Assembly symmetry: C2
């Protein structure tokens, strides 16, 4: 799926699911271009991407994203996020756990799909 | 393929193909267990994994691995590597570039397959 995502100029990050802050260890050019955050501004931040949250970002939506991460579940959540420039965009945030054979999530791939209003 | 690899307890790393030293940004438990190198000893090292090289590691084999990385090519190379404890193992090193739509490698996934002698 990292090949699918990178190959189609998807907008995604990869995070380390083993460390307590779910540190982003990779973000692709498409995620920086869409959100207006520079790669040095995204790297090592929590995988929840709280730097995308603003006033109109709904608490219920933030909680469903955080819950999927905590439960190591695949989930798709529609949410309002904010470009660096303070403009709103609707996003479908697709959390994909990457699990060992024992079923333990080692990484998350999170894909961000822009949704026109 | 990161899902395939992690899900089957393959032994692999992911590297950032954008930075000059091809920095390892992820290594799985199976790669640490097989090679005897701790995760803190592998992280951020070059993706060539020179810490696996010893006397019986052939220069021609090291060069074919490095060439595939430099040319952003998928390649499989059989090579002699060294466990931390100084014992030899034969490895099939499988370099997989992860390219953007424009064809530019952004990451490498490198899988290490033990080969019995």
């Amino acid at each position: 799926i990292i090949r699918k995502f990178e190959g189609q100029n998807k907008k995604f990050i990869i995070a380390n699911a083993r460390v307590q802050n779910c540190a982003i260890i990779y973000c692709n050019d498409g995620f920086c271009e869409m959100t207006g955050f520079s790669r040095p501004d995204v790297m090592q931040k929590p995988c929840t991407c709280d730097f995308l949250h603003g006033p109109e970002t709904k608490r219920h939506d933030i909680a469903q994203i955080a819950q999927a991460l905590l439960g190591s579940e695949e989930r798709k959540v529609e949410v309002t996020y904010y470009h660096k420039n303070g403009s709103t965009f609707i996003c479908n945030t697709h959390i994909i756990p990457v699990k060992n054979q024992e079923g333990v999530a080692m990484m998350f791939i999170i894909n961000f799909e822009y949704v026109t209003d």
